[model samples]
Target: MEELFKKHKIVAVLRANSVEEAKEKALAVFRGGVHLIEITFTVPDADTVIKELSFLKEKGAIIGAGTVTSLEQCQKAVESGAEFIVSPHLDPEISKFCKINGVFYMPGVMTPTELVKAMKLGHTILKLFPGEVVGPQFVKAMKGPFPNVKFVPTGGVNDQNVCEWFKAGVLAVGVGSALVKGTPEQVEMLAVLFVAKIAGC
Candidate 1:
């Protein structure tokens, strides 16, 4: 678990209107130095992206299916070789689905109840989505009570302070849009620079 978090301190997130478009966006992030990536279900043909990414398993990259809301999605993601499953909210069913399948499940949390529930469901790693709204101090406070609960803050988290999160006891962060933006050509440059930033930390 520590190894997984350490490797993906900065996870590149990709979302688009279609599967191929998402792939294209993923390619951009890949060029940017991101080996760990997330593809949200909000995008069309997201499952297809998972299926296709399974073929790239040997790239030594970590792939996770994000926005997973149902048991069915969890099963499909596992079949596609995704080792991690992330969601925007804490749903008991989702948590159990991932845990039972031997997959690392990271469900979103915003309150004490959610945090407790996540831990109870066997999710050691938590995701503080829309992280910008919570700020670093929020994470620090959570770590105090739920010191055993690790975090993966997504949304609003960017290159400027991913390391700060770690200092606050966050395990890793699921970065979206900010890391892979603008054009495909630019995505590589961005991903490379972002990875370099994590390396420095």
Candidate 2:
């Protein structure tokens, strides 16, 4: 999972009104060169979409569940064949569930206390939520205290400044509405744009 993130450097977070839209955007981004697709539970029938896209794992695409806040959601996502689990906030039960199931879990954290808590829970990589509010400099500062902790900053990453996150030493950036909006073609174009933007970094 870490290798995948390091290679792709982007996770296309899909939150749509319908399952069809979620699947469509997932494929679009996958085809457009972004292989990490996160289907957040906010979308109706998110597990069904995850199940349908699980076949992509054979093709090097990592289909994961995002916005997972409960153990039930984590179980459902794992049952649906999600390769990884991402949550907006830290949850020890979810973390432990993923560990027992041998699934990668990326829980969100915003403070030094939460970071330490997550680390104690065995998470080397974490999701820095509302990343735009903290900006790239936040990761730079955190690096001093936790040099080995890798961050995947979600919530506010976009094409215009994605490289800034990488420059700040993030493992990857999770982009939601910014990359998943519009038709599949447009999303694919945006995926290509983002991939190109990060390629040289």
Candidate 3:
């Protein structure tokens, strides 16, 4: 399961009405060739959604909780069967908890200090939030200092720049409305295109 992230280069940021709607959103993403979904806590019944979709893991979709800011959220998410946790900023304790629980925790970072702190906290995969603010060059700059670290840019990622970001050394991307906006069939086709884009297809 750990290698699943390495195998899949895209994470559909699922944000919608409720559990049922979120589930539908994820199904569309899955049909699009995406196998990972980040269910942000902002969604009502986020944990319930995670619990309900836990079964998807068996079908190849790895569900995670995002926008997690507290250890309480982390614990609840894990209890609900979230395979991973993601934050918008550095949270050492949350990172500690994830490490202890064996859940992959992706904390958001922008500057070198934050990145170093996160890496010291034992996080190899990080999220570059508000990605447009920094753009692809920021990723290249960060990579120069930390060659071993991997980054997933969450904001402003799209078909236009997804390939550029991937080419810049990003391990994957967290696509939100841009990737989830279309109908299921359209999303599926877009997914195939993005997947192929990542694979040079």
- Note the Cα lDDT for every prediction shown: 0.77, 0.90, 0.85
What is the Cα root-mean-square deviation between model 2 and the actual structure? 0.9
Please state the error at residue 97 of candidate 3 in Å.
Answer: 1.3
Q: Quick one: best lDDT, which candidate?
A: 2
Clashes of 2: 0
Off by over 4 Å in 1: none
- Lowest summed lDDT across 10 adjacent residues in model 1 is found at 54-63
Give one digit per residue, the lDDT tens place, for model 1 in 32-139.
667778888888767778778775567767777888888787777788777678888888887777767888888888888888877887777788877888887888
Error of 2 at 103 (Å): 0.6
lDDT of 2: 0.90
Model 3, range 39-158, lDDT digits (tens) per residue?
999888899988888678888778899989889988989899988898988899998898898888999898889999998987778999989898889899987779988888898898
Tell me the spans in candidate 3 whose CA falls farther than 4 Å from its real position: none
How many residue-pair clashes does candidate 3 contain? 1
**For model 3, where is the 10-residue window of minimal lDDT?**
179-188
Clashes of each: 3, 0, 1
Question: Candidate 2: TM-score?
Answer: 0.97
TM-score of each: 0.92, 0.97, 0.93
